[PDB]
Scaffold this active site. Sequence first.
Site, short mmCIF file in Angstrom:
data_model
loop_
_atom_site.label_atom_id
_atom_site.label_comp_id
_atom_site.label_asym_id
_atom_site.label_seq_id
_atom_site.Cartn_x
_atom_site.Cartn_y
_atom_site.Cartn_z
N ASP A 96 43.30 24.39 40.32
CA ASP A 96 43.13 25.64 40.82
C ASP A 96 41.87 25.82 41.42
OD1 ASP A 96 44.60 28.74 40.46
OD2 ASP A 96 42.35 28.56 40.30
N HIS A 97 40.78 25.23 40.53
CA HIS A 97 39.42 25.53 40.87
C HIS A 97 38.67 24.69 41.87
CE1 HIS A 97 38.70 27.33 36.25
NE2 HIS A 97 39.74 27.87 37.02
N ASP A 98 39.61 23.74 42.45
CA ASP A 98 39.40 23.02 43.48
C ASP A 98 39.95 23.78 45.00
OD1 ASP A 98 39.94 19.56 44.79
OD2 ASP A 98 38.55 20.87 45.81
C1 HEM Z 1 42.06 27.39 29.45
C2 HEM Z 1 42.94 27.82 30.33
C3 HEM Z 1 42.76 29.00 31.30
C4 HEM Z 1 42.16 30.20 31.14
C5 HEM Z 1 41.02 30.45 30.17
C6 HEM Z 1 42.31 30.77 32.33
C7 HEM Z 1 42.01 32.16 32.57
C8 HEM Z 1 42.19 32.83 33.85
C9 HEM Z 1 41.49 33.96 34.11
C10 HEM Z 1 40.42 34.93 33.12
C11 HEM Z 1 41.66 34.31 35.37
C12 HEM Z 1 41.30 35.75 36.13
C13 HEM Z 1 42.12 36.82 35.52
C14 HEM Z 1 42.12 38.35 36.66
O1 HEM Z 1 42.88 38.17 37.57
O2 HEM Z 1 41.36 39.10 36.24
C15 HEM Z 1 42.57 33.41 36.01
C16 HEM Z 1 42.79 33.29 37.12
C17 HEM Z 1 43.41 32.09 37.66
N1 HEM Z 1 44.02 31.33 36.90
FE1 HEM Z 1 43.77 30.75 35.05
N2 HEM Z 1 43.05 30.34 33.26
C18 HEM Z 1 43.55 29.02 32.58
C19 HEM Z 1 44.36 28.00 33.05
C20 HEM Z 1 44.97 28.03 34.28
C21 HEM Z 1 45.95 27.12 34.85
C22 HEM Z 1 46.55 26.03 33.98
C23 HEM Z 1 46.10 27.52 36.00
C24 HEM Z 1 46.80 26.81 36.87
C25 HEM Z 1 47.89 25.68 36.66
C26 HEM Z 1 45.48 28.69 36.39
C27 HEM Z 1 45.19 29.03 37.68
C28 HEM Z 1 44.73 30.24 37.82
C29 HEM Z 1 44.42 30.91 39.49
C30 HEM Z 1 45.00 30.14 40.45
C31 HEM Z 1 43.67 31.94 39.13
C32 HEM Z 1 42.84 32.74 40.46
C33 HEM Z 1 41.37 31.90 40.68
C34 HEM Z 1 40.78 32.92 41.59
O3 HEM Z 1 39.78 33.47 41.47
O4 HEM Z 1 41.03 32.84 42.78
N3 HEM Z 1 44.76 29.08 35.39
N4 HEM Z 1 42.64 32.48 34.89
C1 LIG Z 2 42.00 29.93 35.51
N1 LIG Z 2 41.09 29.86 36.07
CA LIG Z 3 38.31 22.57 47.64
#
Ligand code: HEM
Ligand SMILES: [C-]#N
Ligand SMILES: [Ca+2]
Lengths: 466, 466, 104, 104
Positions: free
Chosen positions: C94-96
């Site tokens: 997701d972070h890529d």
């Molecule tokens: C250690 C595991 C993970 C977190 C801690 C975590 C936390 C978040 C938070 C705080 C957000 C933003 C929430 C908001 O809208 O205020 C968030 C966004 C996204 N995640 Fe998270 N995440 C953890 C783990 C995952 C995993 C396993 C993911 C997918 C398989 C995953 C995805 C996403 C995505 C796509 C977003 C949006 C990113 C953006 O800024 O565009 N997360 N997560």
């Molecule tokens: C989760 N970002």
């Molecule tokens: Ca990328």
Amino acid sequence: VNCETSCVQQPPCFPLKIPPNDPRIKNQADCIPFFRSCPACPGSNITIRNQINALTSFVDASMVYGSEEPLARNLRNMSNQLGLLAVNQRFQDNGRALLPFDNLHDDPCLLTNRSARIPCFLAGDTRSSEMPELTSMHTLLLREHNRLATELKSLNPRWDGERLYQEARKIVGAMVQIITYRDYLPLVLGPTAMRKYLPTYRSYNDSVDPRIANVFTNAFRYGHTLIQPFMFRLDNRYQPMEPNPRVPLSRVFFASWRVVLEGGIDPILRGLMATPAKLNRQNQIAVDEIRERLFEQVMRIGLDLPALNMQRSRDHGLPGYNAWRRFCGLPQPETVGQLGTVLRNLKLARKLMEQYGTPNNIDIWMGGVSEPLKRKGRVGPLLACIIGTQFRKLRDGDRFWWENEGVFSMQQRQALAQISLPRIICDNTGITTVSKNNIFMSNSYPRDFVNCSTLPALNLASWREA
Amino acid sequence: VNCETSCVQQPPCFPLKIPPNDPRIKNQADCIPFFRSCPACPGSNITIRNQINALTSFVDASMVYGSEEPLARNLRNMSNQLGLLAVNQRFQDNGRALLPFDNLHDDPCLLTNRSARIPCFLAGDTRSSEMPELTSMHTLLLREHNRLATELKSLNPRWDGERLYQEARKIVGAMVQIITYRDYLPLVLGPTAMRKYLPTYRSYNDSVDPRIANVFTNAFRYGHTLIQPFMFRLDNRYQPMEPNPRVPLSRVFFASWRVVLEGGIDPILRGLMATPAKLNRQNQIAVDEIRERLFEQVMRIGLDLPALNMQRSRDHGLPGYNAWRRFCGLPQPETVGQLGTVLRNLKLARKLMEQYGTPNNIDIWMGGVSEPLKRKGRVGPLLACIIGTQFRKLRDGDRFWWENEGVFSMQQRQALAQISLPRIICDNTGITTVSKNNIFMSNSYPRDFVNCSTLPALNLASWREA
Amino acid sequence: CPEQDKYRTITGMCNNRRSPTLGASNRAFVRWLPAEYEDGFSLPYGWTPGVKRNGFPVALARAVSNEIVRFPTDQLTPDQERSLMFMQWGQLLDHDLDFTPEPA
Amino acid sequence: CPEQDKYRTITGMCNNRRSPTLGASNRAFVRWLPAEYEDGFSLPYGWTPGVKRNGFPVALARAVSNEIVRFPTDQLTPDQERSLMFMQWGQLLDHDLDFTPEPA
Ligand code: HEM
Ligand SMILES: [C-]#N
Ligand SMILES: [Ca+2]
Ligand SMILES: *[C@@H]1O[C@H](CO[C@@H]2O[C@@H](C)[C@@H](O)[C@@H](O)[C@@H]2O)[C@@H](O[C@@H]2O[C@H](CO)[C@@H](O[C@@H]3O[C@H](CO[C@H]4O[C@H](CO)[C@@H](O)[C@H](O)[C@@H]4O)[C@@H](O)[C@H](O[C@H]4O[C@H](CO)[C@@H](O)[C@H](O)[C@@H]4O)[C@@H]3O)[C@H](O)[C@H]2NC(C)=O)[C@H](O)[C@H]1NC(C)=O
Ligand SMILES: *[C@@H]1O[C@H](CO[C@@H]2O[C@@H](C)[C@@H](O)[C@@H](O)[C@@H]2O)[C@@H](O[C@@H]2O[C@H](CO)[C@@H](O[C@@H]3O[C@H](CO[C@H]4O[C@H](CO)[C@@H](O)[C@H](O)[C@@H]4O)[C@@H](O)[C@H](O[C@H]4O[C@H](CO)[C@@H](O)[C@H](O)[C@@H]4O)[C@@H]3O)[C@H](O)[C@H]2NC(C)=O)[C@H](O)[C@H]1NC(C)=O
Ligand code: HEM
Ligand SMILES: *[C@@H]1O[C@H](CO)[C@@H](O)[C@H](O)[C@H]1NC(C)=O
Ligand SMILES: *[C@@H]1O[C@H](CO)[C@@H](O)[C@H](O)[C@H]1NC(C)=O
Ligand SMILES: *[C@@H]1O[C@H](CO)[C@@H](O)[C@H](O)[C@H]1NC(C)=O
Ligand SMILES: *[C@@H]1O[C@H](CO)[C@@H](O)[C@H](O)[C@H]1NC(C)=O
Ligand SMILES: [C-]#N
Ligand SMILES: [Br-]
Ligand SMILES: [Br-]
Ligand SMILES: [Br-]
Ligand SMILES: [Br-]
Ligand SMILES: [Br-]
Ligand SMILES: [Br-]
Ligand SMILES: [Br-]
Ligand SMILES: [Br-]
Ligand SMILES: [Ca+2]
């Protein structure tokens, strides 16, 4: 700055550069005036620049009523509770209404005949005066509105101004939709494209995007290829209105004084009915009245409409010919030979390639109007796809579509189905002989014409509030 | 208005309100902090508000190298011509590199343990320290980059730093793509969704829009359902690493000090391998470690991830459940009975109806994670559609897709097809026992493990320039 | 965009040559469907008190989470066919792909 | 948007309940294909001297017009199956659908 007085390429100007050996603009450093379309998000360095539609996308006769509230209220006669549109308080057309005059800054219409001192007209859309024939269509619908409101008032005495205005406005909007989808679009697209892009209406679908697509603003300009180099005027017996029955187009642009001082809208409406459109052919694309002499009287030099169409598509960041063919699921010619096949004209394809190098770079309007016309249509496959796709979304995505359940009653729908442009002309002008249906095909007097008397009036019985 | 310290709702804050009889926040005057996502075109009265992607959509390991040129250069070792990524100058993990520390102003990591005074890590993406398990993956990839650059330096001596950096970054990029589409995605989608949304690769298509869709940013959060309430750490024989083998997640978020002071990345990586993920069940959607105690140590109050996801989808103006089902060609449930059928769970559908009033209003993440999981997949039809469509675009619309002709040689692709996360783990850690492929399925030691010495290393012989 | 290159740019620019910003950093997401805001263009559903969505009251995000998401941890079901690494690759991946900026 | 209504608004606003600006006036056009600008986001092809489009020089709009569009006015072929009204309705209809503003 001023994009009209200099060739300086600085915001917001994008002047057309002149090729060496031009047949008219001998000064290679001169240019054709061009203002970039206003960006949706001014000065952003994040957004991809996009342009703005100032009008309602819907087929709702907003060119009559306006698309912004100040204007809409200013177009209405608020001096009584008759629900009418305001009419010119200075001139009439043999006792009938003309559009009220507008109040512009440097009114372009004043310039077309300096002594006549007739300003541009005020309408729902700012371009009503661009050519007298368009002006006459605008006046026609303004009369139809006031006629309808008057009739509805005899029909329903308790109805106030707002009610009468809205009810007449709704019928006018219905009239534009019916003439357009029933009579006009089938003759644009041809039966095959009509069936593909415009299947039988089922119902309103709120998931259909009704917005105008950017490419449509350029692709619908296919019509420029239909323009004749004259404004034709005919008297009451459909004979040449002397002493000037054929006015070169370069002298009618913004020429509002001709409607006011040269006989009103009737001679113009007969000219539109009794004269053929120009047919688009591959070596006869668009006339010099618009290619060399566009807006000749209101600009420092004559503009080039075809060239302006191409510069506009670039201004708008529009993809080339092949990208649009692909979008439409049509084969993408990559070589001259392949383009020759698609166009059924190797010579044209050669010409295109000498200018563009690759069919991928041909501008959408140019490629679109180059394609051979579909059978009983007036556009080729690419334009058919784009135009047919747009009108489907305007029909299907309109909660106020005339046939949508709940907008009109069944009896109202049956009455509206009988409307025709020829009868509307009969209802609002001194013309007593009009075209046979279909008006867009009929073009030869007296063969294609009949007496107004043989056409039934619109039956408003079902608008009676019981 | 300060969104972190105030519950006042004014730009740019959109605080989540607290309902009555909340199981944790008894005070309804309180709220859960929320900052509206930055608008693409601030203060515009024309554009429909949209949000910004700060990263490259492409699967190119931008989380390792950065998506902006200043960062990207600052992440590189510029003291020699080896083409390496800069490593931590104050700490090592058993003779191996850690990520350099970042220089943040109000560094959240420092607050997770005041006396350790370990700051957040600097990486290609700003969130590398969010959880220790993620940091371990960032550290692992950064090590693989420098290993590749070293080998490539022995393979092609004439190659300057820039050549080594780029050739290493290019192999790493392929590694992220291969692991994602070969091992990961098929287990996300399941067999049927995989074939439908990700057919066999043909080649680069430049008419395929590779942008991340706004909905994806919320739908891919499906992953939040797989999160376990602990960070699990195992020693060399894969047993609980005393004194603290199971640390509450509410005490690991941004806890960079734990990587640096509590064993490095080996105990963490072994934990990810030999511990089951949490399964998403319709009555066991997401744990309280993230629903109640999210980011507790690094702010005034614990957040709720599921709730933030729903507030985020509204912030982003994202359509509701049925609109997305329709976009996906999936049937749209309109009654509670219909919803129960789609969800194969009437009890859940009732809860959803009682919260939302209509399935049309179910927020996209909620509706998405509510659907029963596809066979051999971990999302239902809707999320499968949204996620599968996004990834196909990222693959087909990428000029530098590892399999596109011209990117790598036929011999280079053969060598890359033999890579795997387990082997990468063996190349950059003290762990000599790793999960058997598929690493995303294996989770049981010793049953699902093998020695590193049994796995073939990547052969860089076809990268020889000679 | 350079007529010819060798590697990805760091920002993604020029990956698509006909439309150079596609997939590149610091650009607006693409809309697969038209946005749905309370006022039609900017205000989020749930912003203005009493203002319903599609005929119904907007549910508090925290309320939906309390009523549907919350569950007793003791009931947690370990996934017999996935490793925790399945979760973590997801987050890394997701972070890529996406990061949506907000003001500090 | 109003509970129930009998007439369209003047601006087109609220025609679509879920996304009330669609089809409304003073909104950006919808893009069926990503835009193609010289710099990828704003400058039109033909703006910077020496900047080619996909391998070839940008053809002057006026040159294209002169070489492809120009023809002898006395060669004009009347459409035996279309009236000039066919031309005029198109323009009138165009003016119901779109007007792209520019600075004065
Ligand atoms: C250690 C595991 C993970 C977190 C801690 C975590 C936390 C978040 C938070 C705080 C957000 C933003 C929430 C908001 O809208 O205020 C968030 C966004 C996204 N995640 Fe998270 N995440 C953890 C783990 C995952 C995993 C396993 C993911 C997918 C398989 C995953 C995805 C996403 C995505 C796509 C977003 C949006 C990113 C953006 O800024 O565009 N997360 N997560
Ligand atoms: C989760 N970002
Ligand atoms: Ca990328
Ligand atoms: C390269 O990729 C291009 C993009 O492909 C899409 O994305 C990739 C990732 C794949 O998943 C692929 O399957 C996707 O299609 C691709 O070009 C695309 O080709 C299709 C099929 O030719 C095009 O569809 C046609 O669209 C026109 C226009 O309408 C569309 O746009 C409007 C406005 O947005 C929508 O309202 C419509 O619903 C459509 O989305 C349609 O008129 C046409 O349908 C009509 O004709 C077909 C054929 O008889 C009938 O089945 C229908 O009923 C209609 O009568 C198609 O739906 C698509 O627009 C086009 N996209 C682009 C960006 O060009 C290209 O072909 C790929 N090339 C290769 C070699 O892979
Ligand atoms: C109301 O109208 C809605 C809009 O309809 C469109 O416009 C009208 C005017 C007509 O032209 C109509 O023909 C157009 O479809 C309509 O909703 C639409 O329904 C279609 C059909 O199901 C949806 O298409 C499906 O899309 C999904 C998602 O991918 C799409 O979007 C991506 C991203 O933009 C593109 O890259 C893709 O190419 C798609 O365009 C696809 O997964 C799905 O295809 C898959 O499944 C089918 C069947 O198994 C396979 O053939 C394919 O190979 C794929 O595996 C379809 O392409 C469309 O997304 C949706 N639009 C909207 C706005 O929701 C609705 O059905 C109409 N309702 C009624 C009662 O008429
Ligand atoms: C009397 C006949 C017509 C004109 C005179 C005329 C003129 C123009 C001009 C000057 C433009 C703008 C050029 C530029 O880009 O700088 C223009 C734009 C459009 N037209 Fe024209 N037009 C006449 C006639 C027609 C007919 C018959 C049309 C369609 C069948 C037609 C269409 C269009 C369209 C859709 C545009 C774009 C409008 C917008 O601003 O969005 N025109 N035309
Ligand atoms: C308003 O209507 C009355 C009656 O039809 C008419 O006499 C008057 O001139 C109209 N006013 C305008 C501005 O058109
Ligand atoms: C201009 O209008 C006047 C009426 O004011 C008319 O007499 C004259 O013929 C027109 N001039 C031209 C050049 O047609
Ligand atoms: C750069 O590389 C050299 C040799 O590998 C090493 O001494 C130094 O620590 C590295 N610098 C940084 C900032 O990582
Ligand atoms: C913080 O780290 C220190 C070592 O620097 C350690 O002694 C202590 O246990 C940690 N604090 C907490 C609360 O775990
Ligand atoms: C023409 N407009
Ligand atoms: Br007046
Ligand atoms: Br004009
Ligand atoms: Br007559
Ligand atoms: Br450091
Ligand atoms: Br975060
Ligand atoms: Br080990
Ligand atoms: Br979206
Ligand atoms: Br477009
Ligand atoms: Ca309109």
